[PDB]
Paper text:
[name] has four subunits that form a transmembrane domain (TMD) with a central ion channel pore, an intracellular skirt domain enclosing a large cavity, and amphipathic [name] helices that run nearly parallel to the membrane and interact with both the TMD and the skirt. The TMD is composed of transmembrane helices S1–S6 and a re-entrant pore loop (P-loop) between S5 and S6.
In order to increase the affinity of hTRPV6 to 2-[name], we introduced the [name] mutation, homologous to Y466A in [name]*. As expected, hTRPV6-[name] showed 4.5-fold increased potency of 2-[name] inhibition (IC50 = 60 ± 13 μM, n = 3) compared to hTRPV6. We determined the cryo-EM structure of apo hTRPV6-[name], which is in the open-state conformation, and it is nearly identical (RMSD = 0.765) to the cryo-EM structure of wild-type hTRPV6. Lipids are observed in positions similar to those seen in hTRPV641; lipid 1 is bound in a pocket formed by the intracellular half of the S1–S4 domains and C-terminal part of [name] helix, while lipid 2 is above the S4–S5 linker and contacts both S3 and S4 of the same subunit, and S5–S6 of the neighboring subunit.
Author numbering:
A (entry chain B), B (entry chain C): 28 to 405, 424 to 638
Write the structure that this text describes.
Amino acid sequence: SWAQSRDEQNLLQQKRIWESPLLLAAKDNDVQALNKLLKYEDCKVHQRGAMGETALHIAALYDNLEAAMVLMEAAPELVFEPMTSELYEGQTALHIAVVNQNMNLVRALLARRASVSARATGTAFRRSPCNLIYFGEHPLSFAACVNSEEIVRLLIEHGADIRAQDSLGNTVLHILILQPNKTFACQMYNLLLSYDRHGDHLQPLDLVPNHQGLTPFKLAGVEGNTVMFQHLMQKRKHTQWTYGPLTSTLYDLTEIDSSGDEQSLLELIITTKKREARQILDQTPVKELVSLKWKRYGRPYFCMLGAIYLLYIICFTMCCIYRPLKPRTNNRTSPRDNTLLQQKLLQEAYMTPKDDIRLVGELVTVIGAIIILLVEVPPFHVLIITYAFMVLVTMVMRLISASGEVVPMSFALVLGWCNVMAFARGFQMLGPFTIMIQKMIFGDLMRFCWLMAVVILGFASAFYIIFQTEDPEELGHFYDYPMALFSTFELFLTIIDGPANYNVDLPFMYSITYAAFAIIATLLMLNLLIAMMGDTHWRVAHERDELWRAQIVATTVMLERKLPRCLWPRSGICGREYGLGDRWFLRVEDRQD
Amino acid sequence: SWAQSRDEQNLLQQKRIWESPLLLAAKDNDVQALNKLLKYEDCKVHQRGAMGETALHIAALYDNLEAAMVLMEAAPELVFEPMTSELYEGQTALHIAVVNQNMNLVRALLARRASVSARATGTAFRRSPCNLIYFGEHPLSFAACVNSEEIVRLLIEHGADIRAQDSLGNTVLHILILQPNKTFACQMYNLLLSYDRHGDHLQPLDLVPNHQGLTPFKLAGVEGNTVMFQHLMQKRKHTQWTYGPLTSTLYDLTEIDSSGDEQSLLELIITTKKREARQILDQTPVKELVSLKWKRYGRPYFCMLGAIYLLYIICFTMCCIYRPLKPRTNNRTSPRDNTLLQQKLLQEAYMTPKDDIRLVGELVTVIGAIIILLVEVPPFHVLIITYAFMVLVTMVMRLISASGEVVPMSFALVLGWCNVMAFARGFQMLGPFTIMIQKMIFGDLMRFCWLMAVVILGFASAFYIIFQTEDPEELGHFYDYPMALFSTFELFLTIIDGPANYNVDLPFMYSITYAAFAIIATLLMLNLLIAMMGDTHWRVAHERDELWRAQIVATTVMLERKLPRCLWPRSGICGREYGLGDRWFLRVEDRQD
């Protein structure tokens, strides 16, 4: 809707230039038409367009070098003119001549003393999926993005401050990484770091964060610009001796796995929604860390948590398959050939001190339940926190001592068991299968359960109307509509045997309909779900160890934020005694090929 | 952990050179800084690093030719200096100058009379997956591996003994095969066999075993260096007449299928854990043998064993489906609507001489059981040896004459039957299906049963808590927890019909949970196993006849070690009468294309 308002504003600008004789003469450089229009008669030069145009902006935008030469004699001060409002705010013609790769008015605007500190604070320049581009505010940032090297160099030779920022806090190095051209923009990164002359006594342009606190090295990791990222590692690495085909290189390891303000590089690789930024994990200075971090101190510290969780659920259940549950001494003959039960769940009979051992084993879960919430005072926490509710619920179900106690118990038990699926990630060749289950359910099945619920609410609603006629004493598959859904559900998954009596005849509309149910659902709708399962399985295993590797890291940093020090040293060997400084290093070796 | 100790030692060497002014001057060839440091003042030259450095080692290692020229005037005897300890033991600068492909100090070290017999016995040179390289001890072996031909030739012209060995017994030909460059290293194999001048009266360098007894021809087969292997067959073959497009070539067949110390080449191709070394079996002098060895004398000798095994198991079942087993005259009414039985297994009633024919047929298995153990006094022996236990167990179950006799009987029978799966390998287009079953179970299923046991110990543990309430007289799927696992197990494999009564109402938490069991397991967890089956099936049949060919050979040599001679001639025709010698040959023909 706003883009239409961008388009409604845009054509109004075209109708505006169509009516003004100056700006329509500013479309094409008809200089003989201009000098009759400009030099002879007295025309105002502040003819504003639909959003703040001048003729000086138009000839700069439609590549009229020669027409703007006439404009410089007539307009000495329209260089000092920003574009006005609502898409272009603070844009001048110094920006515009840069965007069209040159004009040599570029040289003439500075010969008329243009302002290179002009900030393009418009909406149509701000970072958005609405704009198809993003180049910041300053024309120096407009210079570096379009890959025009000498045009950049001219701005250095007129005082364009490299250390400028946008509203987002992004400097000119941050804009170069955000461009979709990756190799084509990498050469500017070397040229613009040739002009980092002083550094302003701290962070010499390569460590300056934005408003959200992002160095361009880490932001390169966030966007996953892999080609740029290898080029920034060339600066970071500091090679030691080389031994023929061997190279004892030494990566720097400074912003990777800190405990800083954003706590890592690695979590920022995880917590973005950009799927493609996880390609960095195959790159060797990061790939070596997460293998070393997981091999020693990662994997056995995980399984030591994993061994505790198995003994927890076995204990639970041991205190959940043994339940008090007297024989039925209460109200007897309420099930008149009807809802059967005889246990009724003992009130406070906590005698027989085998039950005191059970009372010990019950308290093992309860104390362990509080620990999980003492962890989680702030896709698998949603298992274990909902595990932590139901253990607390089933004790409140015992302190109040109500009746409906199995209904939180069954949520508690199977999610307690199915949460050790999460522990199968640290047992390699079992990792991404848990990723596969998440890919089936929230990726394919929940956008397919809307298809199965259509069919199943037809036939179950159908069969209730067919078997409204019959005595459900024979053929009790559809005695009522609530279980009719459940009864059709496993005919749909080929479990219930198919309702057939053979003592009496069936009604005639049943035989057609349940046969039509068989064709449309038993072989067809079921197997088309299986091919969706069979499609995504081949999608995962073709990228297997990748999503295994992404599983390890996000597990690892999550383990670090909830485990203290003095049991975990920060990986990579230290400095200051081997004599480089507080930067902590790790080395890696390679053959040439 | 040791690699960190390699890295902790490595940076300490960097801090060591950082503090010493001589070695830091030995980093870059600042000769004007050196002559003030060396020629003017008196500096010791035995400045040892963190593991035994000299400045003579450093300039040799960081490619300072000119700095080492100053070192030769100052240090006449540091050429005679090995690297000291714990990674580099016995390494001198004569080794180091070789590794950097030249220095012409290479010529000058021998001009200072360097020792080419120096043995690099360090840990960081020994064969390991910790080291990324392996080049032995002697610098002649360091010369040939880096593919520097004239630098090799210089060592011949100063007395480098080619016949030297490492601690492993590997000569210089063994190192050339172990390099990952295959074509790039093959040219050294011709050049170094140009200098096998005498041969030391026996094994002229091409038949010298190591400490584990490996000729380089056979070791080429063990590592599967296929490109090198074809080049070694060029030496072995001895071509006869050629007839236009025909070529009556004649491969040598000496170390392939011996009865020597390592009993073959072929078993060594099998019993390595290297999967890729079985690529040799497609190469034509070996591919022709195993086809000829299996076509005649391989296949019908296998099926003659296979015909015996079928009549064995048929005579096994014949004395196992007829069992003595009286009617129940003993304790009657112990199953109070409970565990039923009426046979109780007769003690010693061996009358009715039809049973004596059974007593004959029982002794057929027992004698045949001892033969299998008389074979196996020292993945399918584990079938037949466990077959051999249970037949012995079921006779000890008869001599003691105990009761629990069917429990070893059922292990005995189905593994007796399923061991003739192994006999389907010699019946082409049935071979690799038995390989597929091993690929499913130990390759995919046992790294997936840990996933199924998670789900199945939830829901079976769940349903026991749901159906703790109910009378199990109706709906006896879950009367107890031990059979509750078995009852959920075939709901998981879509066998048991789904527990549904329709006389009474079911408990409410059942209907949700068993429906949730249906979604997560019946279509989802089951079919994702099937796609794993459907993945590896396409992996096997794409490489079908390969793993069929590997199946034949490992079957064949296993048949040779347990069958004597005078029924098996060693294949390939003989010599000494056709006039070449004791080497036994086989010929093969080919069109040009």
